Design a protein around this ligand. Structure first.
Ligand SMILES: NC(=O)c1ccc[n+]([C@@H]2O[C@H](COP(=O)([O-])OP(=O)(O)OC[C@H]3O[C@@H](n4cnc5c(N)ncnc54)[C@H](OP(=O)(O)O)[C@@H]3O)[C@@H](O)[C@H]2O)c1
Ligand SMILES: Nc1nc(=O)c2nc(CNc3ccc(C(=O)N[C@@H](CCC(=O)O)C(=O)O)cc3)cnc2[nH]1
Ligand SMILES: [Mn+2]
Length: 159
């Protein structure tokens, strides 16, 4: 199955000028835990924003143009991306906006972090129909010395 993982600020903002303005170490730890030892699919802008391969994961980059780095796998279409993952139980789609839009109709599971922060951004998580999705896990955390905003981890399954 295909899963999406994302961190959303207020109004479903996920980025600004090809960056993520906030720093929430607990959420990056959640991201690592839920993606380690799985293939991750990302768009080219997100690859540039991360700036290096994610270790312990198969990194698959969507781009219409030839690959410029052989430490990761480059593919030209959604179907090629899925095929390059091979026969694994769970494929993790890690963004950005354009890629999330394309994979949402195929996805069975969403791993969402809702961050209580207002950010002026230029990229949004797709609008998803809430009737389609059941919450199966929810965990709220207040801000602390390490994480400057409160946040909620949620896992939704397609009904
Ligand atoms: N908060 C979060 O959870 C989160 C997660 C991920 C990313 N982000 C942020 O999202 C932003 C980037 O998002 P974005 O929407 O601008 O870009 P993106 O989805 O990361 O990348 C889009 C690019 O990927 C390629 N692509 C997408 N679909 C393709 C397809 N079917 N076939 C071939 N190539 C395809 C294209 O590259 P070519 O132009 O080379 O063809 C396209 O330009 C950044 O701000 C990032 O920090 C946030
Ligand atoms: N929940 C969630 N939060 C995010 O910040 C996030 N970011 C992306 C895209 N951007 C990034 C940017 C940096 C790293 C990163 O450095 N990850 C390290 C963190 C190690 C740690 O802090 O524990 C990694 O090994 O995963 C991952 C994804 C996709 N899905 C997300 N999903
Ligand atoms: Mn197969």
């Amino acid at each position: 199955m295909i899963s999406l993982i994302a961190a959303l600020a207020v109004d479903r903002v996920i980025g600004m000028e090809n960056a993520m303005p906030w720093n929430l170490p607990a959420d990056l730890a959640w991201f690592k835990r839920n993606t380690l030892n799985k293939p991750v699919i990302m768009g080219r802008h997100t690859w540039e924003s991360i700036g290096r391969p994610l270790p312990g994961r198969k990194n698959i980059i969507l781009s219409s143009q030839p690959g410029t780095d052989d430490r990761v796998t480059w593919v030209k279409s959604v179907d090629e991306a899925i095929a390059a993952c091979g026969d694994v139980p769970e494929i993790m789609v890690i963004g950005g906006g354009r890629v999330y839009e394309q994979f949402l109709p195929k996805a069975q599971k969403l791993y969402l972090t809702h961050i209580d922060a207002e950010v002026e951004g230029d990229t949004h998580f797709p609008d998803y129909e809430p009737d389609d999705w059941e919450s199966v896990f929810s965990e709220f955390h207040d801000a602390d010395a390490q994480n400057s905003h409160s946040y909620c981890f949620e896992i939704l399954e397609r009904r």
